Design an enzyme around this catalytic site. Structure first.
Site, PDB file in Angstrom:
ATOM      1  N   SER A 255       4.281   2.988   8.259  1.00  0.00           N
ATOM      2  CA  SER A 255       3.855   1.906   7.362  1.00  0.00           C
ATOM      3  C   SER A 255       4.984   1.434   6.458  1.00  0.00           C
ATOM      4  CB  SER A 255       2.675   2.341   6.494  1.00  0.00           C
ATOM      5  OG  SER A 255       1.494   2.367   7.258  1.00  0.00           O
ATOM      6  N   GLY A 256       5.026   0.126   6.196  1.00  0.00           N
ATOM      7  CA  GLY A 256       6.060  -0.481   5.353  1.00  0.00           C
ATOM      8  C   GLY A 256       7.310  -0.844   6.143  1.00  0.00           C
TER       9      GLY A 256
ATOM     10  N   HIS B  12       0.798  -1.228   0.000  1.00  0.00           N
ATOM     11  CA  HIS B  12       0.000   0.000   0.000  1.00  0.00           C
ATOM     12  C   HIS B  12       0.835   1.286   0.000  1.00  0.00           C
ATOM     13  CE1 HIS B  12       0.347   0.697   4.464  1.00  0.00           C
ATOM     14  NE2 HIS B  12       0.196   1.944   4.046  1.00  0.00           N
TER      15      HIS B  12
ATOM     16  N   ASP C  97      -0.446  -7.311   2.081  1.00  0.00           N
ATOM     17  CA  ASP C  97       0.203  -5.986   2.120  1.00  0.00           C
ATOM     18  C   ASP C  97       1.726  -6.169   2.278  1.00  0.00           C
ATOM     19  OD1 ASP C  97       0.370  -3.169   2.042  1.00  0.00           O
ATOM     20  OD2 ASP C  97      -0.206  -2.887   4.113  1.00  0.00           O
TER      21      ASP C  97
HETATM   22  C1  LIG Z   1      -8.732  -1.666   4.151  1.00  0.00           C
HETATM   23  C2  LIG Z   1      -8.811  -1.613   5.680  1.00  0.00           C
HETATM   24  C3  LIG Z   1      -8.217  -2.880   6.326  1.00  0.00           C
HETATM   25  N1  LIG Z   1      -8.192  -0.342   6.164  1.00  0.00           N
HETATM   26  C4  LIG Z   1      -6.704  -0.123   5.914  1.00  0.00           C
HETATM   27  C5  LIG Z   1      -6.280   1.360   6.080  1.00  0.00           C
HETATM   28  C6  LIG Z   1      -6.940   2.019   7.291  1.00  0.00           C
HETATM   29  N2  LIG Z   1      -6.524   3.194   7.839  1.00  0.00           N
HETATM   30  C7  LIG Z   1      -7.325   3.483   8.879  1.00  0.00           C
HETATM   31  C8  LIG Z   1      -7.245   4.668   9.795  1.00  0.00           C
HETATM   32  O1  LIG Z   1      -7.978   4.676  10.774  1.00  0.00           O
HETATM   33  N3  LIG Z   1      -6.375   5.625   9.492  1.00  0.00           N
HETATM   34  C9  LIG Z   1      -6.082   6.910  10.114  1.00  0.00           C
HETATM   35  C10 LIG Z   1      -7.110   7.780  10.495  1.00  0.00           C
HETATM   36  C11 LIG Z   1      -6.823   9.012  11.097  1.00  0.00           C
HETATM   37  C12 LIG Z   1      -7.941   9.929  11.484  1.00  0.00           C
HETATM   38  O2  LIG Z   1      -8.949   9.921  10.732  1.00  0.00           O
HETATM   39  O3  LIG Z   1      -7.853  10.658  12.521  1.00  0.00           O
HETATM   40  C13 LIG Z   1      -5.503   9.385  11.329  1.00  0.00           C
HETATM   41  C14 LIG Z   1      -4.467   8.540  10.960  1.00  0.00           C
HETATM   42  C15 LIG Z   1      -4.750   7.306  10.351  1.00  0.00           C
HETATM   43  C16 LIG Z   1      -3.522   6.449  10.000  1.00  0.00           C
HETATM   44  C17 LIG Z   1      -2.996   5.831  11.307  1.00  0.00           C
HETATM   45  C18 LIG Z   1      -2.094   4.642  11.057  1.00  0.00           C
HETATM   46  O4  LIG Z   1      -1.461   4.570  10.000  1.00  0.00           O
HETATM   47  N4  LIG Z   1      -2.065   3.752  12.048  1.00  0.00           N
HETATM   48  C19 LIG Z   1      -1.169   2.653  12.288  1.00  0.00           C
HETATM   49  C20 LIG Z   1      -0.594   1.940  11.215  1.00  0.00           C
HETATM   50  C21 LIG Z   1       0.090   0.750  11.445  1.00  0.00           C
HETATM   51  C22 LIG Z   1       0.204   0.287  12.745  1.00  0.00           C
HETATM   52 CL1  LIG Z   1       1.065  -1.216  13.001  1.00  0.00          CL
HETATM   53  C23 LIG Z   1      -0.352   0.985  13.825  1.00  0.00           C
HETATM   54  C24 LIG Z   1      -1.044   2.175  13.597  1.00  0.00           C
HETATM   55  S1  LIG Z   1      -8.571   2.379   9.223  1.00  0.00           S
HETATM   56  C25 LIG Z   1      -8.025   1.452   7.907  1.00  0.00           C
HETATM   57  C26 LIG Z   1      -8.704   0.149   7.495  1.00  0.00           C
END
Ligand SMILES: CC(C)N1CCc2nc(C(=O)Nc3cc(C(=O)O)ccc3CCC(=O)Nc3ccc(Cl)cc3)sc2C1
Ligand SMILES: [Ca+2]
Ligand SMILES: [Ca+2]
Lengths: 54, 233
Positions: B185-186, B42, B88
Protein backbone atom coordinates in the site's frame (compact mmCIF):
# COMPACT_ATOMS: atom_id res chain seq x y z
CA UNK A 1 -10.45 6.45 -37.82
CA UNK A 2 -7.34 7.12 -35.76
CA UNK A 3 -6.00 10.60 -36.37
CA UNK A 4 -3.49 12.96 -34.76
CA UNK A 5 -2.69 11.86 -31.19
CA UNK A 6 -4.70 8.67 -31.80
CA UNK A 7 -2.37 7.66 -34.61
CA UNK A 8 0.76 6.30 -32.90
CA UNK A 9 0.72 9.12 -30.27
CA UNK A 10 1.22 11.74 -33.04
CA UNK A 11 4.85 10.51 -33.34
CA UNK A 12 5.55 12.25 -29.96
CA UNK A 13 7.93 10.69 -27.41
CA UNK A 14 5.74 11.61 -24.45
CA UNK A 15 2.67 13.91 -24.23
CA UNK A 16 0.54 14.54 -27.32
CA UNK A 17 -2.14 17.23 -27.57
CA UNK A 18 -4.43 18.14 -30.44
CA UNK A 19 -4.65 21.84 -31.29
CA UNK A 20 -6.70 23.06 -34.25
CA UNK A 21 -6.18 20.12 -36.56
CA UNK A 22 -2.62 19.53 -35.53
CA UNK A 23 -0.52 17.40 -33.18
CA UNK A 24 1.43 19.25 -30.47
CA UNK A 25 4.03 17.19 -28.60
CA UNK A 26 5.46 17.98 -25.16
CA UNK A 27 7.59 16.42 -22.41
CA UNK A 28 7.68 15.69 -18.68
CA UNK A 29 9.39 18.10 -16.33
CA UNK A 30 13.15 17.69 -16.65
CA UNK A 31 12.95 17.05 -20.38
CA UNK A 32 13.17 19.42 -23.28
CA UNK A 33 11.39 18.97 -26.61
CA UNK A 34 13.93 18.31 -29.39
CA UNK A 35 14.36 20.46 -32.51
CA UNK A 36 12.11 18.12 -34.49
CA UNK A 37 9.32 19.09 -32.06
CA UNK A 38 8.75 15.39 -31.26
CA UNK A 39 11.56 13.77 -29.24
CA UNK A 40 12.10 14.55 -25.52
CA UNK A 41 15.66 15.19 -24.27
CA UNK A 42 16.77 14.86 -20.62
CA UNK A 43 18.18 18.18 -19.44
CA UNK A 44 20.40 16.60 -16.82
CA UNK A 45 21.29 13.49 -14.78
CA UNK A 46 18.73 10.92 -13.55
CA UNK A 47 15.70 12.25 -15.48
CA UNK A 48 12.30 10.95 -14.28
CA UNK A 49 10.91 7.75 -15.71
CA UNK A 50 14.26 6.18 -16.60
CA UNK A 51 15.55 2.99 -14.94
CA UNK A 52 19.14 3.57 -13.75
CA UNK A 53 22.20 1.95 -15.43
CA UNK A 54 24.87 3.91 -13.54
CA UNK B 1 3.67 -8.59 -4.04
CA UNK B 2 2.15 -11.97 -4.89
CA UNK B 3 3.81 -13.55 -7.92
CA UNK B 4 5.76 -11.29 -10.27
CA UNK B 5 9.52 -10.86 -10.17
CA UNK B 6 12.38 -9.33 -8.22
CA UNK B 7 13.21 -5.80 -9.19
CA UNK B 8 16.66 -6.27 -10.68
CA UNK B 9 19.42 -3.73 -10.20
CA UNK B 10 18.17 -0.32 -11.36
CA UNK B 11 14.69 -1.49 -12.42
CA UNK B 12 12.46 0.12 -9.77
CA UNK B 13 14.46 3.19 -8.69
CA UNK B 14 11.31 5.21 -7.77
CA UNK B 15 10.32 2.78 -4.98
CA UNK B 16 10.23 4.31 -1.50
CA UNK B 17 9.51 2.36 1.72
CA UNK B 18 7.90 3.93 4.79
CA UNK B 19 9.64 2.43 7.81
CA UNK B 20 8.44 2.54 11.43
CA UNK B 21 10.45 3.23 14.63
CA UNK B 22 11.47 -0.46 14.66
CA UNK B 23 12.84 -0.17 11.08
CA UNK B 24 10.15 -2.40 9.60
CA UNK B 25 8.40 -1.37 6.36
CA UNK B 26 4.61 -0.93 6.57
CA UNK B 27 3.83 0.93 3.34
CA UNK B 28 5.34 1.96 0.01
CA UNK B 29 5.77 5.28 -1.76
CA UNK B 30 6.91 6.72 -5.12
CA UNK B 31 9.73 9.19 -5.56
CA UNK B 32 8.34 12.27 -7.36
CA UNK B 33 11.39 14.55 -7.00
CA UNK B 34 14.42 15.15 -4.72
CA UNK B 35 12.01 16.41 -2.01
CA UNK B 36 8.65 14.66 -2.51
CA UNK B 37 7.25 11.19 -1.92
CA UNK B 38 3.81 10.07 -3.13
CA UNK B 39 1.91 7.65 -0.91
CA UNK B 40 -1.56 6.57 0.36
CA UNK B 41 -3.45 8.66 2.88
CA UNK B 42 -4.40 5.50 4.80
CA UNK B 43 -0.73 4.63 5.36
CA UNK B 44 -0.40 7.63 7.67
CA UNK B 45 -2.62 5.92 10.23
CA UNK B 46 -0.32 2.85 10.29
CA UNK B 47 2.41 4.43 12.50
CA UNK B 48 3.06 7.33 14.90
CA UNK B 49 6.54 8.16 13.64
CA UNK B 50 8.05 6.97 10.35
CA UNK B 51 10.85 7.70 7.91
CA UNK B 52 11.34 7.05 4.21
CA UNK B 53 13.90 4.61 2.79
CA UNK B 54 15.02 4.72 -0.84
CA UNK B 55 17.57 2.70 -2.85
CA UNK B 56 16.79 -0.56 -1.05
CA UNK B 57 16.17 -3.85 -2.88
CA UNK B 58 17.20 -6.40 -0.23
CA UNK B 59 16.25 -5.47 3.36
CA UNK B 60 18.56 -8.14 4.78
CA UNK B 61 21.75 -6.78 3.14
CA UNK B 62 23.57 -3.44 2.80
CA UNK B 63 23.98 -2.92 -0.96
CA UNK B 64 25.46 0.56 -0.53
CA UNK B 65 22.79 2.61 -2.29
CA UNK B 66 20.42 2.92 0.68
CA UNK B 67 19.28 6.27 2.13
CA UNK B 68 16.90 7.02 4.99
CA UNK B 69 15.09 10.36 4.92
CA UNK B 70 13.11 12.14 7.57
CA UNK B 71 9.69 13.51 6.83
CA UNK B 72 9.31 17.26 7.24
CA UNK B 73 5.67 17.70 6.16
CA UNK B 74 2.80 15.24 5.70
CA UNK B 75 0.31 16.53 3.13
CA UNK B 76 -2.79 14.35 3.33
CA UNK B 77 -5.85 14.85 1.08
CA UNK B 78 -8.42 16.56 3.30
CA UNK B 79 -11.27 14.61 1.71
CA UNK B 80 -9.76 11.20 2.69
CA UNK B 81 -11.99 8.91 4.75
CA UNK B 82 -11.33 5.49 6.34
CA UNK B 83 -14.98 4.65 5.69
CA UNK B 84 -14.64 4.40 1.91
CA UNK B 85 -10.87 4.81 1.28
CA UNK B 86 -11.86 7.57 -1.15
CA UNK B 87 -9.21 10.26 -1.82
CA UNK B 88 -6.46 7.79 -0.75
CA UNK B 89 -3.45 9.99 -1.58
CA UNK B 90 -0.79 11.90 0.33
CA UNK B 91 2.44 13.65 -0.47
CA UNK B 92 5.45 13.76 1.87
CA UNK B 93 8.06 16.51 1.87
CA UNK B 94 11.45 15.32 3.14
CA UNK B 95 13.80 17.22 5.48
CA UNK B 96 16.77 16.59 3.16
CA UNK B 97 16.78 16.19 -0.65
CA UNK B 98 17.14 12.71 -2.17
CA UNK B 99 20.43 12.23 -4.02
CA UNK B 100 19.61 10.44 -7.25
CA UNK B 101 21.92 7.55 -8.08
CA UNK B 102 21.70 3.90 -9.06
CA UNK B 103 18.39 2.51 -7.72
CA UNK B 104 17.33 6.06 -6.67
CA UNK B 105 15.37 8.10 -9.25
CA UNK B 106 11.93 9.73 -9.72
CA UNK B 107 9.04 8.44 -11.84
CA UNK B 108 7.44 11.00 -14.22
CA UNK B 109 4.12 12.68 -13.49
CA UNK B 110 2.03 12.54 -16.67
CA UNK B 111 -0.48 15.05 -17.99
CA UNK B 112 -4.12 14.05 -17.26
CA UNK B 113 -5.80 13.74 -20.66
CA UNK B 114 -2.85 11.99 -22.25
CA UNK B 115 -2.35 9.56 -19.31
CA UNK B 116 -6.05 8.62 -19.37
CA UNK B 117 -6.23 8.27 -23.17
CA UNK B 118 -2.79 6.78 -23.71
CA UNK B 119 -1.31 5.31 -20.53
CA UNK B 120 -4.42 3.83 -18.96
CA UNK B 121 -5.45 2.22 -22.22
CA UNK B 122 -2.20 0.21 -22.38
CA UNK B 123 -2.53 -3.52 -21.61
CA UNK B 124 -0.68 -3.42 -18.29
CA UNK B 125 0.74 -1.36 -15.45
CA UNK B 126 3.53 -2.18 -13.00
CA UNK B 127 3.00 -2.31 -9.25
CA UNK B 128 5.97 -2.89 -6.90
CA UNK B 129 6.81 -3.29 -3.20
CA UNK B 130 8.16 -5.19 -0.17
CA UNK B 131 4.68 -6.37 0.87
CA UNK B 132 3.39 -9.86 1.60
CA UNK B 133 4.20 -12.66 -0.83
CA UNK B 134 0.75 -14.12 -0.18
CA UNK B 135 -2.36 -13.22 1.83
CA UNK B 136 -1.25 -14.99 5.03
CA UNK B 137 2.49 -14.74 4.39
CA UNK B 138 5.12 -12.44 5.81
CA UNK B 139 6.58 -9.35 4.14
CA UNK B 140 9.11 -9.75 1.38
CA UNK B 141 12.73 -8.89 2.27
CA UNK B 142 13.14 -8.49 -1.52
CA UNK B 143 11.72 -5.64 -3.56
CA UNK B 144 9.36 -7.08 -6.15
CA UNK B 145 7.53 -5.88 -9.25
CA UNK B 146 4.47 -7.28 -11.03
CA UNK B 147 2.85 -6.54 -14.38
CA UNK B 148 -0.91 -6.03 -13.77
CA UNK B 149 -3.53 -5.63 -16.55
CA UNK B 150 -5.82 -2.60 -16.43
CA UNK B 151 -9.24 -3.94 -15.47
CA UNK B 152 -12.49 -2.77 -17.03
CA UNK B 153 -14.23 -0.33 -14.67
CA UNK B 154 -17.67 -2.00 -14.76
CA UNK B 155 -16.25 -5.51 -14.22
CA UNK B 156 -14.40 -4.15 -11.24
CA UNK B 157 -17.48 -2.50 -9.73
CA UNK B 158 -19.40 -5.75 -10.16
CA UNK B 159 -16.55 -7.72 -8.59
CA UNK B 160 -16.37 -5.48 -5.50
CA UNK B 161 -18.19 -5.68 -2.15
CA UNK B 162 -17.32 -2.01 -1.48
CA UNK B 163 -17.90 1.16 -3.55
CA UNK B 164 -15.40 2.01 -6.34
CA UNK B 165 -15.33 5.79 -6.50
CA UNK B 166 -14.22 8.01 -9.39
CA UNK B 167 -10.82 8.30 -7.56
CA UNK B 168 -10.07 4.60 -7.87
CA UNK B 169 -9.30 2.16 -10.64
CA UNK B 170 -8.77 -1.57 -10.81
CA UNK B 171 -5.88 -3.66 -12.02
CA UNK B 172 -4.74 -7.24 -11.72
CA UNK B 173 -6.15 -10.61 -12.56
CA UNK B 174 -9.49 -12.33 -12.08
CA UNK B 175 -8.20 -15.78 -11.04
CA UNK B 176 -4.43 -15.77 -11.74
CA UNK B 177 -2.49 -15.76 -8.43
CA UNK B 178 -0.73 -12.41 -8.83
CA UNK B 179 -1.57 -9.19 -6.98
CA UNK B 180 -0.24 -6.53 -4.66
CA UNK B 181 -0.74 -7.37 -0.98
CA UNK B 182 -0.47 -6.05 2.58
CA UNK B 183 2.57 -3.79 2.93
CA UNK B 184 2.61 -2.69 -0.72
CA UNK B 185 0.00 0.00 0.00
CA UNK B 186 1.10 3.57 -0.82
CA UNK B 187 3.57 2.16 -3.37
CA UNK B 188 4.08 2.78 -7.11
CA UNK B 189 1.75 1.83 -9.92
CA UNK B 190 3.49 3.03 -13.08
CA UNK B 191 2.97 2.65 -16.82
CA UNK B 192 5.76 2.32 -19.36
CA UNK B 193 5.54 4.31 -22.59
CA UNK B 194 8.56 4.21 -24.93
CA UNK B 195 11.02 3.20 -22.17
CA UNK B 196 9.79 5.95 -19.81
CA UNK B 197 7.82 5.26 -16.68
CA UNK B 198 4.90 7.43 -15.54
CA UNK B 199 3.05 7.23 -12.20
CA UNK B 200 -0.49 6.07 -12.93
CA UNK B 201 -1.66 4.83 -9.53
CA UNK B 202 -1.12 4.33 -5.83
CA UNK B 203 -1.56 0.87 -4.25
CA UNK B 204 -4.73 1.42 -2.22
CA UNK B 205 -6.70 -1.70 -1.23
CA UNK B 206 -8.04 -5.17 -2.01
CA UNK B 207 -10.26 -7.90 -0.56
CA UNK B 208 -7.43 -10.22 0.47
CA UNK B 209 -4.63 -10.73 -2.04
CA UNK B 210 -5.02 -12.47 -5.39
CA UNK B 211 -8.49 -13.81 -4.40
CA UNK B 212 -10.53 -15.21 -7.33
CA UNK B 213 -12.93 -12.64 -8.77
CA UNK B 214 -11.24 -9.75 -6.93
CA UNK B 215 -8.87 -7.09 -8.28
CA UNK B 216 -6.28 -4.66 -6.93
CA UNK B 217 -7.69 -1.20 -6.22
CA UNK B 218 -5.48 1.85 -6.86
CA UNK B 219 -5.88 5.58 -6.33
CA UNK B 220 -6.40 7.17 -9.74
CA UNK B 221 -3.39 9.50 -9.74
CA UNK B 222 -4.56 11.19 -12.95
CA UNK B 223 -7.50 12.68 -10.98
CA UNK B 224 -5.01 14.21 -8.53
CA UNK B 225 -2.45 15.88 -10.82
CA UNK B 226 -3.40 19.46 -9.93
CA UNK B 227 -3.57 18.44 -6.27
CA UNK B 228 -0.06 16.88 -6.40
CA UNK B 229 1.37 19.90 -8.25
CA UNK B 230 -0.15 22.21 -5.60
CA UNK B 231 1.22 19.99 -2.82
CA UNK B 232 4.76 20.12 -4.28
CA UNK B 233 4.33 23.94 -4.21
C1 LIG C 1 -13.04 1.16 3.16
C2 LIG C 1 -13.07 0.00 2.17
C3 LIG C 1 -13.00 0.49 0.71
N1 LIG C 1 -12.01 -0.99 2.53
C4 LIG C 1 -10.55 -0.54 2.45
C5 LIG C 1 -9.59 -1.48 3.23
C6 LIG C 1 -9.94 -2.96 3.02
N2 LIG C 1 -9.09 -3.98 3.32
C7 LIG C 1 -9.71 -5.14 3.02
C8 LIG C 1 -9.17 -6.53 3.17
O1 LIG C 1 -9.83 -7.45 2.70
N3 LIG C 1 -8.00 -6.68 3.79
C9 LIG C 1 -7.23 -7.86 4.15
C10 LIG C 1 -7.85 -8.97 4.75
C11 LIG C 1 -7.10 -10.10 5.09
C12 LIG C 1 -7.78 -11.27 5.75
O2 LIG C 1 -8.73 -10.99 6.53
O3 LIG C 1 -7.41 -12.46 5.50
C13 LIG C 1 -5.74 -10.15 4.83
C14 LIG C 1 -5.11 -9.06 4.24
C15 LIG C 1 -5.85 -7.92 3.90
C16 LIG C 1 -5.05 -6.79 3.23
C17 LIG C 1 -4.78 -7.21 1.78
C18 LIG C 1 -4.40 -6.03 0.90
O4 LIG C 1 -3.86 -5.04 1.41
N4 LIG C 1 -4.70 -6.18 -0.39
C19 LIG C 1 -4.29 -5.42 -1.53
C20 LIG C 1 -4.04 -4.03 -1.43
C21 LIG C 1 -3.86 -3.26 -2.58
C22 LIG C 1 -3.91 -3.88 -3.81
CL1 LIG C 1 -3.69 -2.89 -5.24
C23 LIG C 1 -4.14 -5.26 -3.94
C24 LIG C 1 -4.33 -6.03 -2.79
S1 LIG C 1 -11.28 -5.03 2.37
C25 LIG C 1 -11.14 -3.34 2.50
C26 LIG C 1 -12.28 -2.40 2.08
CA1 LIG D 1 19.58 -3.32 1.55
CA1 LIG E 1 -8.17 -11.86 -8.54
Amino acid sequence: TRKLCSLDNGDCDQFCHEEQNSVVCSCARGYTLADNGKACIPTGPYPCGKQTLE
Amino acid sequence: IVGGQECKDGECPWQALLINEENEGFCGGTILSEFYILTAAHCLYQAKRFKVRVGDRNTEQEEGGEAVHEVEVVIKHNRFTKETYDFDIAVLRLKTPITFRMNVAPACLPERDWAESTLMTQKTGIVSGFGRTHEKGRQSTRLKMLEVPYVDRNSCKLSSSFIITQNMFCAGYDTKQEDACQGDSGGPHVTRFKDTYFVTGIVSWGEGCARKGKYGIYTKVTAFLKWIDRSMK
